[PDB]
Design a protein around this nucleic acid. Sequence first.
DNA 1: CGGCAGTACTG
DNA 2: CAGTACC
DNA 3: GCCG
Length: 310
Amino acid sequence: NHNLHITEKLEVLAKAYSVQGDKWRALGYAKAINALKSFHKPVTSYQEACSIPGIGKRMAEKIIEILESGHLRKLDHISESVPVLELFSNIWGAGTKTAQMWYQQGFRSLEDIRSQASLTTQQAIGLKHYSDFLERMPREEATEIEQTVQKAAQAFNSGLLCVACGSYRRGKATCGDVDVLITHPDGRSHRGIFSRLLDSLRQEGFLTDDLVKGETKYLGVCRLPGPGRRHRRLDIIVVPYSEFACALLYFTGSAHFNRSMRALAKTKGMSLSEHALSTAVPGRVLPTPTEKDVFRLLGLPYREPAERDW
DNA sequence: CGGCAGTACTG
DNA sequence: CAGTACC
DNA sequence: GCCG
Ligand SMILES: [Mg+2]
Ligand SMILES: [Mg+2]
Ligand code: NA
Ligand code: NA
């Protein structure tokens, strides 16, 4: 990354737009930052800046300004509210609209939120684990969490397949949470397990709080036994076997890789979601028994998970 | 001008 | 429904 | 914000 003198400054703008709710401008900044972080050379021309995909006129100029003067004028005019909005929206279950409302109501600290804000069930859990949920775990801990869920699932039914995806499957040393995907080859026996499986995981004291408990996806909080353990975010998603390849691909990510893959599909008159690869104009679901089939039907060479870490 | 993803979940 | 979250 |  020969341009972190640029990307540091842009990252500040990106987050300011994100926490103020301008998600599209925030997306554009994010794309340009990612492009800047994988070019070979240091940029050093407005015509060089225009060179790279994801960088246009307005952002070329900003590189041209940090070009010469060494900083970016726009940074000095970011609203004083941004760090507080960032603080509030790092509560799980609070996004930009809730953060801006709390700010308008005069709240400025998590002590204000704790003492005086009306919190949803999810946000109260978010607040209780504010520090824990900002911490990444070693991938070795992610393995223990997966094997905990797997053990509990394979007790009620031997055939259940359980795979940790996200950054874990992409090979990262750190993980922000553990994303566990469960299916069954019989195509049948995957339904209705949650009641049994979550009650089991509660039997241990392993599951500590539930954030979402739907028919198909569970999001909550777990903690392994012993001293020195932190609470960790856990997602468990159950899918029919026919959709396993697309779900594996979606939940393995990364999010920018999936975004790149949806765009490529659209250029071919298809669509790609966590459930299926389809034709589109809805369209026809194409058969994808393996991740390799998704790439092949998109005319792409297969990429192992570790090379999807975009 | 307008897409840049679709869906599951909560209340 | 709006808002938030999953990658 | 970018790009078609
Ligand atoms: Mg994850
Ligand atoms: Mg997750
Ligand atoms: Na460009
Ligand atoms: Na949040």
